Design a protein around this ligand. Structure first.
Ligand SMILES: COCCO[C@H]1CO[C@@H]2OC[C@H](OC(=O)N[C@@H](Cc3ccccc3)[C@H](O)CN(CC(C)C)S(=O)(=O)c3ccc(N)cc3)[C@@H]21
Ligand SMILES: [Cl-]
Ligand SMILES: [Cl-]
Ligand SMILES: [Cl-]
Lengths: 99, 99
């Protein structure tokens, strides 16, 4: 699809069988989701944005469907204000910016 | 242009007679720039991201050129860790996500 930016670019994702809403975010290097359960082991990461840093849990090689497009990659979980799909997964689903 | 998301989507902007690098950020409602002077009225605003909120000055009706494309809109100025072009100006240059 082509998504214009007059409203937030919120899409439905599916992860661990569950539907969630997430923001397609070209300003995020990494995908970060609100608190949830994921399988396997996690590693620590500190991520920074507007108001400073948060600690998150890094899960690798997680299947996730984004607007119907399949991806498998790194998902960070922590106290983000909103679910954000970052460039690590936007690249997997073939996303570009165009103007 | 078509802008790949393998790297951060950084572009050159011109604003208040200054050239600056900024991130094209579909996850930002608003354009937020590191400390700088702009002309005209402003009012204080809190904006919130990963890590919490920062106080910024909100300037309205500011001309900007992004990648050669002229636009006008609101610019927030304050202690953001990096210059971000948000949707309020991305719409004006006809920027879309495509996949
Ligand atoms: C809060 O009230 C609602 C509006 O609050 C937000 C939305 O609109 C407003 O405009 C300015 C601000 O927007 C943002 O801050 N946008 C961020 C996403 C976001 C969106 C909503 C809430 C919080 C964050 C941004 O696209 C990504 N961030 C990096 C960037 C800013 C360099 S990051 O998130 O820090 C990040 C860093 C690393 C990874 N790996 C992942 C993410 C305000
Ligand atoms: Cl990844
Ligand atoms: Cl505006
Ligand atoms: Cl349009």
């Amino acid at each position: 699809p082509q998504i214009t930016l007059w409203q937030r670019p919120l899409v439905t994702i599916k992860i661990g069988g569950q539907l969630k809403e997430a923001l397609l975010d070209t300003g995020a290097d990494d995908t970060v989701l609100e608190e949830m359960s994921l399988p396997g082991r996690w590693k620590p990461k500190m991520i920074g944005g507007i108001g400073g840093f948060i600690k998150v849990r890094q899960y690798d090689q997680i299947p996730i469907e984004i607007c119907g497009h399949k991806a498998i990659g790194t998902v960070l979980v922590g106290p983000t204000p909103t679910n954000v799909i970052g460039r690590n997964l936007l690249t997997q689903i073939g996303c570009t910016l165009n103007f």
